Design an enzyme around this catalytic site. Structure first.
Site, PDB file in Angstrom:
ATOM      1  N   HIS A  68       0.837  -1.219   0.000  1.00  0.00           N
ATOM      2  CA  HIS A  68       0.000   0.000   0.000  1.00  0.00           C
ATOM      3  C   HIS A  68       0.867   1.263   0.000  1.00  0.00           C
ATOM      4  CE1 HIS A  68      -3.275  -2.841   1.241  1.00  0.00           C
ATOM      5  NE2 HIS A  68      -3.943  -2.081   0.387  1.00  0.00           N
ATOM      6  N   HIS A  72       1.577   1.561  -5.728  1.00  0.00           N
ATOM      7  CA  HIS A  72       0.143   1.169  -5.800  1.00  0.00           C
ATOM      8  C   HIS A  72      -0.705   2.382  -6.206  1.00  0.00           C
ATOM      9  CE1 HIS A  72      -3.691  -0.703  -4.796  1.00  0.00           C
ATOM     10  NE2 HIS A  72      -3.909   0.214  -3.875  1.00  0.00           N
ATOM     11  N   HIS A 106      -6.132   7.412  -2.901  1.00  0.00           N
ATOM     12  CA  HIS A 106      -7.158   6.533  -2.296  1.00  0.00           C
ATOM     13  C   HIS A 106      -6.589   5.715  -1.133  1.00  0.00           C
ATOM     14  CE1 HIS A 106      -5.358   3.269  -4.508  1.00  0.00           C
ATOM     15  NE2 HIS A 106      -6.063   2.443  -3.738  1.00  0.00           N
ATOM     16  N   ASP A 107      -5.271   5.617  -0.973  1.00  0.00           N
ATOM     17  CA  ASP A 107      -4.682   4.840   0.165  1.00  0.00           C
ATOM     18  C   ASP A 107      -3.719   5.746   0.954  1.00  0.00           C
ATOM     19  OD1 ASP A 107      -5.909   2.227   0.316  1.00  0.00           O
ATOM     20  OD2 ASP A 107      -4.623   1.519  -1.375  1.00  0.00           O
ATOM     21  N   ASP A 217      -8.373  -0.593  -8.224  1.00  0.00           N
ATOM     22  CA  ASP A 217      -7.742  -1.032  -6.956  1.00  0.00           C
ATOM     23  C   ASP A 217      -7.274  -2.467  -7.073  1.00  0.00           C
ATOM     24  OD1 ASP A 217      -6.736  -0.475  -4.452  1.00  0.00           O
ATOM     25  OD2 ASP A 217      -8.592  -1.044  -3.456  1.00  0.00           O
ATOM     26  N   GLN A 269      -5.680 -17.575  -3.848  1.00  0.00           N
ATOM     27  CA  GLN A 269      -5.820 -16.712  -5.046  1.00  0.00           C
ATOM     28  C   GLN A 269      -7.062 -17.151  -5.826  1.00  0.00           C
ATOM     29  OE1 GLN A 269      -3.992 -13.856  -6.033  1.00  0.00           O
ATOM     30  NE2 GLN A 269      -3.909 -14.090  -3.811  1.00  0.00           N
TER      31      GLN A 269
HETATM   32  C1  IFR Z   1      -5.183  -7.441  -5.939  1.00  0.00           C
HETATM   33  C2  IFR Z   1      -5.479  -8.232  -4.699  1.00  0.00           C
HETATM   34  N1  IFR Z   1      -6.240  -7.589  -3.753  1.00  0.00           N
HETATM   35  C3  IFR Z   1      -6.584  -8.250  -2.542  1.00  0.00           C
HETATM   36  C4  IFR Z   1      -7.391  -7.547  -1.504  1.00  0.00           C
HETATM   37  N2  IFR Z   1      -6.122  -9.611  -2.361  1.00  0.00           N
HETATM   38  N3  IFR Z   1      -6.339 -10.506  -1.359  1.00  0.00           N
HETATM   39  C5  IFR Z   1      -5.680 -11.656  -1.582  1.00  0.00           C
HETATM   40  C6  IFR Z   1      -5.704 -12.813  -0.632  1.00  0.00           C
HETATM   41  C7  IFR Z   1      -6.578 -13.909  -1.220  1.00  0.00           C
HETATM   42  C8  IFR Z   1      -6.627 -15.041  -0.251  1.00  0.00           C
HETATM   43  N4  IFR Z   1      -5.554 -15.704   0.176  1.00  0.00           N
HETATM   44  C9  IFR Z   1      -6.007 -16.652   1.030  1.00  0.00           C
HETATM   45  N5  IFR Z   1      -5.154 -17.510   1.766  1.00  0.00           N
HETATM   46  C10 IFR Z   1      -5.780 -18.619   2.332  1.00  0.00           C
HETATM   47  C11 IFR Z   1      -4.649 -19.415   2.900  1.00  0.00           C
HETATM   48  C12 IFR Z   1      -3.417 -19.037   2.166  1.00  0.00           C
HETATM   49  C13 IFR Z   1      -3.844 -17.832   1.383  1.00  0.00           C
HETATM   50  N6  IFR Z   1      -7.313 -16.619   1.148  1.00  0.00           N
HETATM   51  N7  IFR Z   1      -7.720 -15.610   0.289  1.00  0.00           N
HETATM   52  C14 IFR Z   1      -9.080 -15.199   0.004  1.00  0.00           C
HETATM   53  N8  IFR Z   1      -5.080 -11.584  -2.842  1.00  0.00           N
HETATM   54  C15 IFR Z   1      -5.396 -10.285  -3.291  1.00  0.00           C
HETATM   55  C16 IFR Z   1      -5.066  -9.598  -4.529  1.00  0.00           C
HETATM   56  C17 IFR Z   1      -4.271 -10.399  -5.531  1.00  0.00           C
HETATM   57 MG    MG Z   2      -7.338   0.921   0.591  1.00  0.00          MG
HETATM   58 ZN    ZN Z   3      -5.751   0.459  -2.811  1.00  0.00          ZN
END
Ligand code: IFR
Ligand code: MG
Ligand code: ZN
Length: 314
Positions: A68, A72, A106-107, A217, A269
């Protein structure tokens, strides 16, 4: 007045595409942003001396956290720029002006922690702003910077244009709270499908700009696979530091934030691309057809994550 910003040829051409990466040379990011406001908005949108001073105060108020950060900010503004240039005639002069600023801002002053951690830590910001904690803080930081002397880039707007642009930026920054995304996209889904969706309805524009904000975002899922993969390392470097801090307060973090669950990143992912990204870019493409390359790029990166799980990697 007669002063065009230009970029080298490869950047000049590749900046117009959705999947552009702004590169590792920090000192070019401001030139890239100014180039995008000039081409998106016009060379008369902002006084150059004020814009440069605003950009540099904004930069100084991003922190050196793994994800962040200033990179970004400019990445999210570049995606917005691609959306605005591929749908030139759907948007007002005030929207073009406000949305790129919104994305850069925005951040502002993010610390690398979720709203959740602020609330569980009992950070002062969580008493001042009970929901969308960091996002109300980000808008508040924008207004501060706009009030520094020589920083009001909106000085030449009327009194009521000024209030309208600050209102577009406030709603735009609030919408980057991914807790608000699910309901916003559900409602945009149903309004498009029943044919009720109307771009003259101000509260309909609001939801549409909100979805564009979520798209920009999340645009790290729409890049070339090596950029997508390496950003994910930055993204988890924050989440796992938060997980560490959660455990310090005596709390099991969610799996997303637990570095003991490194092994399952691929599946996490998948969840994220299926629960959030794909739906986001699906609804955005229906509503704005020229954004399709974000959907197609997202779909390509989901295949790359499936490939990682299967043992092929790419
Ligand atoms: C652009 C972007 N923006 C946001 C807010 N995120 N958030 C993620 C985490 C996704 C995730 N990882 C996991 N774990 C579960 C156990 C090992 C990993 N669960 N989940 C749902 N990736 C992103 C990206 C690529
Ligand atoms: Mg934010
Ligand atoms: Zn952001």
């Amino acid at each position: 007045g007669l002063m065009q910003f230009t970029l080298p040829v490869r950047l000049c051409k590749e900046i117009e595409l959705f999947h552009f990466d702004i590169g590792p040379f920090e000192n070019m990011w401001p030139g890239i942003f100014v180039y995008m406001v000039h081409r998106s908005c016009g060379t008369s949108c902002f006084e150059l001396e004020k814009l440069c001073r605003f950009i540099m105060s904004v930069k100084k108020n991003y922190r050196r956290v793994p994800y962040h950060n200033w990179k970004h900010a400019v990445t999210v503004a570049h995606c917005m720029y691609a959306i605005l240039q591929n749908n030139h005639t759907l948007f007002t002069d005030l929207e073009r002006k406000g949305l790129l600023i919104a994305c850069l801002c925005h951040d502002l002053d993010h610390r690398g922690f979720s709203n959740s951690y602020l609330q569980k830590f009992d950070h002062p910001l969580a008493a001042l702003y009970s929901t969308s904690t960091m996002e109300q803080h980000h808008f508040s930081q924008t207004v501060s910077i706009l009030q520094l002397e020589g920083h009001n880039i909106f000085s030449t707007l009327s009194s009521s244009e000024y209030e309208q642009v600050l209102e577009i930026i406030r709603k735009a920054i609030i919408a980057t709270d991914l807790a608000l995304y699910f309901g916003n996209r559900k409602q945009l889904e149903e309004m498009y499908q029943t044919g009720s969706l109307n771009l003259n309805n101000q509260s309909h524009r609001d939801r549409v700009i909100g979805l564009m904000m979520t798209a920009c975002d999340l645009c790290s899922v729409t890049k070339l696979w090596p950029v997508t993969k390496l950003t994910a390392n930055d993204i988890y470097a924050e989440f796992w530091a938060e997980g560490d801090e959660m455990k310090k307060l005596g709390i099991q973090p969610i799996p997303m934030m637990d570095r003991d669950k490194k092994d399952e990143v691929p599946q996490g992912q998948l969840g994220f691309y299926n629960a959030v990204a794909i739906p986001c870019y699906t609804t955005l493409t229906q509503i704005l057809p020229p954004t399709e390359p974000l959907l197609k790029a997202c779909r390509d990166n989901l295949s790359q994550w499936e490939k990682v799980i299967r043992g092929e990697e790419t």
